[PDB]
Amino acid sequence: LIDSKGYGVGTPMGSPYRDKITIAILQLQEEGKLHMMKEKWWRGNGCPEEE
Amino acid sequence: LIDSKGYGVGTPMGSPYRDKITIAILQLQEEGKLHMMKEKWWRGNGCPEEE
Amino acid sequence: IDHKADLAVAPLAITYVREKVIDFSKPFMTLGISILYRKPNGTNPGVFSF
Amino acid sequence: IDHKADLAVAPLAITYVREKVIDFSKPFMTLGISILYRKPNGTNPGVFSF
Amino acid sequence: AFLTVERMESPIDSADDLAKQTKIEYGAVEDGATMTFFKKSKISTYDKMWA
Ligand SMILES: *[C@@H]1O[C@H](CO)[C@@H](O)[C@H](O)[C@H]1NC(C)=O
Ligand SMILES: *[C@@H]1O[C@H](CO)[C@@H](O)[C@H](O)[C@H]1NC(C)=O
């Protein structure tokens, strides 16, 4: 890795949705299903094409 | 990497300094000054390789 | 900026230019610049390699 | 939570249990679990050596 | 060629590779971030690590 620029979700400044989405994303990270989602959408399609 | 935990500074709920401290952290990361201090002491002495 | 969509979930890097104007959540996945390079070709194929 | 500290600049892992209580800034470093094993040195078994 | 070059390589190079083997015992910190993450991980390559 050279840089470090994580992604995110857009939200207007005067909107309380940012904190709730933060909580939900942290919940997903703790549950670990973000890892399996990334594996499905990155490795799962590429699994038959493994080296 | 196994997990993707993140660090960060702590602020009380609704504190107005979070929205500016995140701006400062992002500016430091963009200018690369966070990477210099990340390499400031983690490379304490280097890896001795002779072979 | 104009509230036509109030949640723009997409691949959208967290940046200083954006963060002043738009308000982001935590990074749901972190990445960075990485170097892509083709694997070193070798003279492995060929039954007559001996 | 008691406002006794205005900031908590420290290696605080961003977690759901903490986020419901306090407010975190965006991470300055992204870390995670990793394997620490000793640097391999010159060694080999008996039969697999040859 | 092996004796001249001597390219040392660790038996384990990824999480699943360490999971499959049983000679090298794993490690963690009791009531720490790593151990708590491994608990309730419900991930295929980490459930056996927790076991
Ligand atoms: C190895 O060299 C060949 C010929 O120069 C070229 O196609 C490429 O750089 C490598 N080929 C493969 C299949 O990796
Ligand atoms: C070489 O590695 C072995 C691993 O079993 C270790 O026991 C030994 O102390 C090492 N010798 C060194 C680092 O000189």
Swiss-Prot record, chains A, B:
Highest expression is found in the olfactory lobe, piriform cortex, dentate gyrus, hippocampus, granular cell layer of the cerebellum, and in caudate-putamen. It is found in: Cell membrane; Postsynaptic cell membrane. Sumoylation mediates kainate receptor-mediated endocytosis and regulates synaptic transmission. Sumoylation is enhanced by PIAS3 and desumoylated by SENP1. Ionotropic glutamate receptor that functions as a cation-permeable ligand-gated ion channel, gated by L-glutamate and the glutamatergic agonist kainic acid. L-glutamate acts as an excitatory neurotransmitter at many synapses in the central nervous system. Binding of the excitatory neurotransmitter L-glutamate induces a conformation change, leading to the opening of the cation channel, and thereby converts the chemical signal to an electrical impulse. The receptor then desensitizes rapidly and enters a transient inactive state, characterized by the presence of bound agonist. Independent of its ionotropic glutamate receptor activity, acts as a thermoreceptor conferring sensitivity to cold temperatures. Functions in dorsal root ganglion neurons. The postsynaptic actions of Glu are mediated by a variety of receptors that are named according to their selective agonists. This receptor binds domoate > kainate > quisqualate > glutamate. It does not bind AMPA without coexpression with GRIK5. Belongs to the glutamate-gated ion channel (TC 1.A.10.1) family. GRIK2 subfamily. Homotetramer and heterotetramer with GRIK5. Tetramers may be formed by the dimerization of dimers. Assembles into a kainate-gated homomeric channel that does not bind AMPA. Can form functional heteromeric receptors with GRIK4 and GRIK5. Can form functional heteromeric receptors with GRIK3. Interacts with DLG4. Interacts with NETO2. Interacts (via C-terminus) with KLHL17 (via kelch repeats); the interaction targets GRIK2 for degradation via ubiquitin-proteasome pathway. This is Glutamate receptor ionotropic, kainate 2.
